[PDB]
Write a protein that binds this ligand. Structure first.
Ligand code: HEM
Ligand code: HEM
Lengths: 145, 145
Protein backbone atom coordinates (compact mmCIF):
# COMPACT_ATOMS: atom_id res chain seq x y z
CA UNK A 1 0.00 0.00 0.00
CA UNK A 2 1.19 3.52 -0.76
CA UNK A 3 0.61 4.59 2.85
CA UNK A 4 2.89 1.83 4.13
CA UNK A 5 5.52 2.51 1.47
CA UNK A 6 5.62 6.20 2.39
CA UNK A 7 6.38 5.18 5.98
CA UNK A 8 9.60 3.62 4.67
CA UNK A 9 11.02 7.10 4.10
CA UNK A 10 13.05 7.29 7.31
CA UNK A 11 14.97 10.35 8.53
CA UNK A 12 18.26 9.37 6.92
CA UNK A 13 16.58 8.36 3.66
CA UNK A 14 14.92 11.77 3.40
CA UNK A 15 18.24 13.46 4.18
CA UNK A 16 20.06 11.55 1.44
CA UNK A 17 17.29 12.39 -1.03
CA UNK A 18 17.62 16.11 -0.26
CA UNK A 19 21.42 16.22 -0.34
CA UNK A 20 21.59 14.46 -3.69
CA UNK A 21 18.69 16.45 -5.16
CA UNK A 22 20.50 19.68 -4.28
CA UNK A 23 23.02 18.70 -6.94
CA UNK A 24 20.90 16.74 -9.44
CA UNK A 25 18.01 19.20 -9.37
CA UNK A 26 20.41 22.07 -10.12
CA UNK A 27 20.36 21.24 -13.83
CA UNK A 28 16.88 19.97 -14.62
CA UNK A 29 17.25 20.24 -18.39
CA UNK A 30 20.61 18.48 -18.60
CA UNK A 31 19.95 15.81 -15.98
CA UNK A 32 16.37 15.32 -17.14
CA UNK A 33 17.40 14.52 -20.71
CA UNK A 34 20.26 12.38 -19.39
CA UNK A 35 17.77 10.36 -17.35
CA UNK A 36 15.47 9.77 -20.33
CA UNK A 37 18.23 9.00 -22.83
CA UNK A 38 19.71 6.42 -20.42
CA UNK A 39 16.31 4.77 -19.98
CA UNK A 40 15.86 4.41 -23.74
CA UNK A 41 19.41 3.11 -24.13
CA UNK A 42 19.26 0.57 -21.29
CA UNK A 43 15.65 -0.42 -21.95
CA UNK A 44 14.85 -0.02 -25.65
CA UNK A 45 11.58 -1.88 -25.05
CA UNK A 46 10.18 1.21 -23.29
CA UNK A 47 10.61 3.46 -26.34
CA UNK A 48 7.27 2.26 -27.69
CA UNK A 49 5.45 4.01 -24.85
CA UNK A 50 6.91 7.37 -25.95
CA UNK A 51 5.74 7.44 -29.58
CA UNK A 52 4.45 11.00 -29.11
CA UNK A 53 7.99 12.31 -28.52
CA UNK A 54 9.15 11.35 -32.00
CA UNK A 55 12.78 10.45 -32.69
CA UNK A 56 14.15 10.04 -29.16
CA UNK A 57 17.74 9.52 -30.39
CA UNK A 58 18.05 13.24 -31.20
CA UNK A 59 18.31 13.95 -27.48
CA UNK A 60 18.44 17.63 -26.52
CA UNK A 61 17.64 18.64 -30.11
CA UNK A 62 14.19 17.04 -29.85
CA UNK A 63 11.88 19.76 -28.51
CA UNK A 64 9.19 17.33 -27.30
CA UNK A 65 11.76 15.16 -25.54
CA UNK A 66 13.33 18.23 -23.95
CA UNK A 67 9.95 19.57 -22.83
CA UNK A 68 9.03 16.17 -21.41
CA UNK A 69 12.37 15.77 -19.64
CA UNK A 70 12.30 19.16 -17.96
CA UNK A 71 8.76 18.52 -16.75
CA UNK A 72 9.76 15.13 -15.36
CA UNK A 73 12.32 16.87 -13.15
CA UNK A 74 9.62 19.11 -11.66
CA UNK A 75 7.66 16.01 -10.66
CA UNK A 76 10.71 14.88 -8.66
CA UNK A 77 11.06 18.41 -7.26
CA UNK A 78 7.43 18.14 -6.13
CA UNK A 79 8.14 14.85 -4.33
CA UNK A 80 11.24 16.17 -2.53
CA UNK A 81 9.31 19.25 -1.41
CA UNK A 82 6.58 17.06 0.13
CA UNK A 83 8.94 14.89 2.20
CA UNK A 84 8.09 16.79 5.39
CA UNK A 85 4.40 15.85 5.22
CA UNK A 86 3.50 12.20 4.45
CA UNK A 87 -0.11 13.18 3.79
CA UNK A 88 0.90 15.62 1.06
CA UNK A 89 3.52 13.27 -0.40
CA UNK A 90 0.89 10.57 -0.80
CA UNK A 91 -1.72 12.74 -2.51
CA UNK A 92 0.87 14.09 -4.97
CA UNK A 93 2.15 10.56 -5.63
CA UNK A 94 -1.34 9.16 -6.34
CA UNK A 95 -2.03 12.15 -8.61
CA UNK A 96 1.06 11.41 -10.66
CA UNK A 97 0.22 7.68 -10.57
CA UNK A 98 -3.04 8.27 -12.44
CA UNK A 99 -1.27 9.58 -15.55
CA UNK A 100 0.95 6.51 -15.68
CA UNK A 101 -1.92 4.13 -14.86
CA UNK A 102 -3.80 5.62 -17.82
CA UNK A 103 -0.86 4.68 -20.06
CA UNK A 104 -0.85 1.12 -18.72
CA UNK A 105 2.50 1.49 -16.99
CA UNK A 106 2.90 -1.22 -14.36
CA UNK A 107 4.94 -1.07 -11.17
CA UNK A 108 7.58 -3.35 -12.71
CA UNK A 109 7.80 -1.12 -15.78
CA UNK A 110 8.09 2.02 -13.67
CA UNK A 111 10.86 0.40 -11.66
CA UNK A 112 13.09 0.42 -14.73
CA UNK A 113 13.86 4.05 -13.90
CA UNK A 114 16.09 2.92 -10.99
CA UNK A 115 18.93 1.97 -13.32
CA UNK A 116 19.05 5.39 -15.05
CA UNK A 117 18.81 7.20 -11.70
CA UNK A 118 21.69 5.17 -10.30
CA UNK A 119 23.80 6.09 -13.33
CA UNK A 120 23.01 9.81 -13.29
CA UNK A 121 23.71 9.83 -9.55
CA UNK A 122 27.05 8.07 -10.10
CA UNK A 123 28.07 10.62 -12.73
CA UNK A 124 27.85 13.22 -9.95
CA UNK A 125 29.74 11.23 -7.30
CA UNK A 126 26.68 9.85 -5.47
CA UNK A 127 27.05 6.11 -4.89
CA UNK A 128 24.82 3.17 -3.95
CA UNK A 129 23.77 4.75 -0.66
CA UNK A 130 21.98 7.43 -2.68
CA UNK A 131 20.70 5.14 -5.43
CA UNK A 132 19.05 3.01 -2.74
CA UNK A 133 17.47 6.09 -1.17
CA UNK A 134 15.97 7.03 -4.53
CA UNK A 135 14.84 3.44 -5.02
CA UNK A 136 12.77 3.84 -1.84
CA UNK A 137 11.06 6.96 -3.20
CA UNK A 138 10.35 5.25 -6.52
CA UNK A 139 8.86 2.40 -4.45
CA UNK A 140 6.24 4.79 -3.09
CA UNK A 141 5.10 5.45 -6.64
CA UNK A 142 5.19 1.73 -7.45
CA UNK A 143 2.82 1.06 -4.55
CA UNK A 144 0.25 3.34 -6.21
CA UNK A 145 0.35 1.79 -9.69
CA UNK B 1 2.19 30.92 -32.93
CA UNK B 2 3.29 30.05 -29.39
CA UNK B 3 6.62 31.74 -30.09
CA UNK B 4 4.75 34.89 -31.13
CA UNK B 5 2.74 34.87 -27.91
CA UNK B 6 5.95 34.37 -25.93
CA UNK B 7 7.22 37.56 -27.58
CA UNK B 8 4.72 39.51 -25.47
CA UNK B 9 6.76 38.47 -22.44
CA UNK B 10 8.93 41.59 -22.21
CA UNK B 11 11.70 42.20 -19.66
CA UNK B 12 9.28 44.15 -17.47
CA UNK B 13 6.64 41.43 -17.68
CA UNK B 14 9.16 38.72 -16.75
CA UNK B 15 10.35 40.82 -13.82
CA UNK B 16 6.84 41.21 -12.42
CA UNK B 17 6.20 37.49 -12.91
CA UNK B 18 9.32 36.50 -10.97
CA UNK B 19 8.75 39.00 -8.16
CA UNK B 20 5.16 37.94 -7.62
CA UNK B 21 6.00 34.24 -7.91
CA UNK B 22 8.57 34.61 -5.13
CA UNK B 23 5.59 35.15 -2.81
CA UNK B 24 2.74 33.18 -4.42
CA UNK B 25 4.97 30.19 -5.11
CA UNK B 26 6.23 30.13 -1.52
CA UNK B 27 3.04 28.38 -0.34
CA UNK B 28 2.12 26.04 -3.16
CA UNK B 29 -0.47 24.05 -1.21
CA UNK B 30 -2.18 27.13 0.21
CA UNK B 31 -2.26 29.24 -2.96
CA UNK B 32 -2.79 26.34 -5.33
CA UNK B 33 -5.98 25.34 -3.51
CA UNK B 34 -7.07 28.97 -3.25
CA UNK B 35 -6.72 29.23 -7.04
CA UNK B 36 -8.78 26.13 -7.76
CA UNK B 37 -11.48 26.91 -5.21
CA UNK B 38 -11.81 30.45 -6.56
CA UNK B 39 -12.11 29.10 -10.10
CA UNK B 40 -14.95 26.81 -8.97
CA UNK B 41 -16.67 29.55 -6.99
CA UNK B 42 -16.56 32.13 -9.79
CA UNK B 43 -17.10 29.73 -12.69
CA UNK B 44 -19.14 26.81 -11.35
CA UNK B 45 -19.42 25.35 -14.85
CA UNK B 46 -15.71 24.46 -14.76
CA UNK B 47 -16.38 21.85 -12.06
CA UNK B 48 -17.75 19.63 -14.82
CA UNK B 49 -14.19 18.99 -15.98
CA UNK B 50 -13.05 17.85 -12.53
CA UNK B 51 -15.33 14.90 -11.72
CA UNK B 52 -12.22 12.86 -10.82
CA UNK B 53 -11.48 15.16 -7.88
CA UNK B 54 -14.74 14.27 -6.15
CA UNK B 55 -16.23 16.55 -3.51
CA UNK B 56 -14.40 19.75 -4.40
CA UNK B 57 -16.45 21.52 -1.72
CA UNK B 58 -14.14 20.05 0.93
CA UNK B 59 -11.34 22.23 -0.40
CA UNK B 60 -7.95 21.70 1.25
CA UNK B 61 -9.25 18.63 3.13
CA UNK B 62 -9.94 16.81 -0.15
CA UNK B 63 -6.76 14.81 -0.85
CA UNK B 64 -7.32 14.57 -4.62
CA UNK B 65 -8.00 18.29 -4.88
CA UNK B 66 -4.97 19.07 -2.70
CA UNK B 67 -2.75 16.77 -4.75
CA UNK B 68 -3.97 18.34 -7.99
CA UNK B 69 -3.50 21.89 -6.72
CA UNK B 70 0.07 21.40 -5.53
CA UNK B 71 0.96 19.85 -8.88
CA UNK B 72 -0.59 22.75 -10.78
CA UNK B 73 1.77 25.10 -8.95
CA UNK B 74 4.83 23.15 -10.11
CA UNK B 75 3.63 23.68 -13.68
CA UNK B 76 3.78 27.41 -13.02
CA UNK B 77 7.14 27.00 -11.27
CA UNK B 78 8.39 25.30 -14.44
CA UNK B 79 7.15 28.18 -16.64
CA UNK B 80 8.71 30.82 -14.38
CA UNK B 81 12.06 29.02 -14.37
CA UNK B 82 12.08 28.86 -18.20
CA UNK B 83 11.35 32.57 -18.78
CA UNK B 84 14.89 33.47 -19.89
CA UNK B 85 15.03 30.89 -22.67
CA UNK B 86 12.11 31.15 -25.14
CA UNK B 87 12.99 27.80 -26.72
CA UNK B 88 12.66 25.95 -23.42
CA UNK B 89 9.58 27.93 -22.37
CA UNK B 90 7.86 27.00 -25.61
CA UNK B 91 8.59 23.26 -25.44
CA UNK B 92 7.35 23.07 -21.84
CA UNK B 93 4.19 25.07 -22.63
CA UNK B 94 3.43 22.82 -25.60
CA UNK B 95 4.01 19.71 -23.47
CA UNK B 96 1.55 21.05 -20.91
CA UNK B 97 -0.99 22.06 -23.57
CA UNK B 98 -1.28 18.47 -24.79
CA UNK B 99 -2.88 17.33 -21.52
CA UNK B 100 -5.50 20.08 -21.70
CA UNK B 101 -6.11 19.61 -25.43
CA UNK B 102 -6.82 15.92 -24.80
CA UNK B 103 -9.46 17.03 -22.30
CA UNK B 104 -11.07 19.32 -24.87
CA UNK B 105 -10.23 22.48 -22.93
CA UNK B 106 -10.50 25.48 -25.27
CA UNK B 107 -8.40 28.64 -25.07
CA UNK B 108 -11.47 30.57 -23.92
CA UNK B 109 -12.21 28.06 -21.17
CA UNK B 110 -8.56 28.10 -20.06
CA UNK B 111 -8.66 31.89 -19.88
CA UNK B 112 -11.17 31.65 -17.05
CA UNK B 113 -8.18 31.18 -14.74
CA UNK B 114 -7.29 34.87 -15.12
CA UNK B 115 -9.92 36.01 -12.63
CA UNK B 116 -8.79 33.58 -9.90
CA UNK B 117 -5.15 34.53 -10.46
CA UNK B 118 -5.95 38.22 -10.09
CA UNK B 119 -7.79 37.52 -6.82
CA UNK B 120 -5.00 35.37 -5.38
CA UNK B 121 -2.43 38.03 -6.33
CA UNK B 122 -4.57 40.75 -4.74
CA UNK B 123 -4.81 38.69 -1.54
CA UNK B 124 -1.04 39.08 -1.27
CA UNK B 125 -1.24 42.74 -2.32
CA UNK B 126 -0.06 42.46 -5.93
CA UNK B 127 -2.15 44.87 -8.00
CA UNK B 128 -3.37 45.05 -11.60
CA UNK B 129 0.17 45.48 -12.93
CA UNK B 130 0.99 41.94 -11.83
CA UNK B 131 -2.37 40.52 -12.91
CA UNK B 132 -1.72 41.87 -16.41
CA UNK B 133 1.71 40.21 -16.45
CA UNK B 134 0.20 36.88 -15.47
CA UNK B 135 -2.52 37.23 -18.10
CA UNK B 136 0.25 37.45 -20.69
CA UNK B 137 1.83 34.22 -19.44
CA UNK B 138 -1.58 32.56 -19.58
CA UNK B 139 -1.89 33.86 -23.16
CA UNK B 140 1.21 31.89 -24.18
CA UNK B 141 -0.59 28.71 -23.09
CA UNK B 142 -3.81 29.78 -24.82
CA UNK B 143 -1.85 30.13 -28.07
CA UNK B 144 -1.14 26.39 -27.91
CA UNK B 145 -4.74 25.30 -27.33
C1 HEM C 1 11.34 8.95 -11.85
C2 HEM C 1 10.19 8.34 -12.47
C3 HEM C 1 9.30 8.98 -13.33
C4 HEM C 1 8.77 10.23 -13.21
C5 HEM C 1 8.92 11.18 -12.02
C6 HEM C 1 7.91 10.44 -14.36
C7 HEM C 1 7.26 11.65 -14.64
C8 HEM C 1 6.38 11.88 -15.70
C9 HEM C 1 5.68 13.14 -15.93
C10 HEM C 1 5.68 14.36 -15.02
C11 HEM C 1 4.98 13.01 -17.09
C12 HEM C 1 4.30 14.17 -17.81
C13 HEM C 1 2.88 14.48 -17.35
C14 HEM C 1 1.87 13.45 -17.82
O1 HEM C 1 1.56 13.42 -19.03
O2 HEM C 1 1.39 12.67 -16.98
C15 HEM C 1 5.19 11.65 -17.54
C16 HEM C 1 4.66 11.10 -18.72
C17 HEM C 1 4.89 9.78 -19.16
N1 HEM C 1 5.58 8.81 -18.44
FE1 HEM C 1 6.68 9.02 -16.75
N2 HEM C 1 7.83 9.29 -15.13
C18 HEM C 1 8.70 8.40 -14.53
C19 HEM C 1 8.98 7.11 -15.04
C20 HEM C 1 8.35 6.53 -16.15
C21 HEM C 1 8.66 5.21 -16.68
C22 HEM C 1 9.75 4.30 -16.13
C23 HEM C 1 7.81 4.97 -17.72
C24 HEM C 1 7.66 3.79 -18.44
C25 HEM C 1 8.74 3.02 -19.00
C26 HEM C 1 7.00 6.18 -17.85
C27 HEM C 1 6.06 6.41 -18.88
C28 HEM C 1 5.45 7.64 -19.18
C29 HEM C 1 4.72 7.89 -20.41
C30 HEM C 1 4.43 6.85 -21.50
C31 HEM C 1 4.41 9.22 -20.42
C32 HEM C 1 3.73 9.98 -21.56
C33 HEM C 1 4.68 10.83 -22.38
C34 HEM C 1 3.97 11.63 -23.46
O3 HEM C 1 3.39 11.00 -24.37
O4 HEM C 1 3.99 12.87 -23.39
N3 HEM C 1 7.36 7.12 -16.90
N4 HEM C 1 6.05 10.96 -16.67
C1 HEM D 1 -2.65 28.59 -14.78
C2 HEM D 1 -3.48 27.62 -15.44
C3 HEM D 1 -3.46 26.22 -15.27
C4 HEM D 1 -2.42 25.41 -14.87
C5 HEM D 1 -0.98 25.81 -14.53
C6 HEM D 1 -2.92 24.04 -14.90
C7 HEM D 1 -2.16 22.92 -14.54
C8 HEM D 1 -2.56 21.59 -14.68
C9 HEM D 1 -1.71 20.44 -14.43
C10 HEM D 1 -0.21 20.44 -14.17
C11 HEM D 1 -2.50 19.33 -14.56
C12 HEM D 1 -2.12 17.93 -14.10
C13 HEM D 1 -1.22 17.21 -15.09
C14 HEM D 1 -1.95 16.78 -16.34
O1 HEM D 1 -2.66 15.74 -16.30
O2 HEM D 1 -1.83 17.48 -17.36
C15 HEM D 1 -3.79 19.79 -15.02
C16 HEM D 1 -4.89 18.96 -15.24
C17 HEM D 1 -6.16 19.39 -15.63
N1 HEM D 1 -6.50 20.71 -15.91
FE1 HEM D 1 -5.35 22.36 -15.71
N2 HEM D 1 -4.23 24.01 -15.37
C18 HEM D 1 -4.59 25.32 -15.55
C19 HEM D 1 -5.88 25.73 -15.91
C20 HEM D 1 -6.94 24.90 -16.22
C21 HEM D 1 -8.28 25.36 -16.54
C22 HEM D 1 -8.77 26.80 -16.44
C23 HEM D 1 -9.01 24.26 -16.88
C24 HEM D 1 -10.27 24.23 -17.47
C25 HEM D 1 -11.49 24.52 -16.80
C26 HEM D 1 -8.15 23.10 -16.67
C27 HEM D 1 -8.59 21.76 -16.72
C28 HEM D 1 -7.83 20.65 -16.34
C29 HEM D 1 -8.33 19.29 -16.27
C30 HEM D 1 -9.75 18.83 -16.62
C31 HEM D 1 -7.32 18.51 -15.78
C32 HEM D 1 -7.45 17.08 -15.26
C33 HEM D 1 -7.78 17.05 -13.77
C34 HEM D 1 -7.86 15.64 -13.21
O3 HEM D 1 -8.67 14.83 -13.73
O4 HEM D 1 -7.12 15.34 -12.24
N3 HEM D 1 -6.89 23.51 -16.27
N4 HEM D 1 -3.83 21.19 -15.10
Amino acid sequence: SVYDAAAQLTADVKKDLRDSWKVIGSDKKGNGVALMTTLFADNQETIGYFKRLGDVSQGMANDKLRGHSITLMYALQNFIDQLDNPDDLVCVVEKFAVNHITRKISAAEFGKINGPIKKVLASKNFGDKYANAWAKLVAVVQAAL
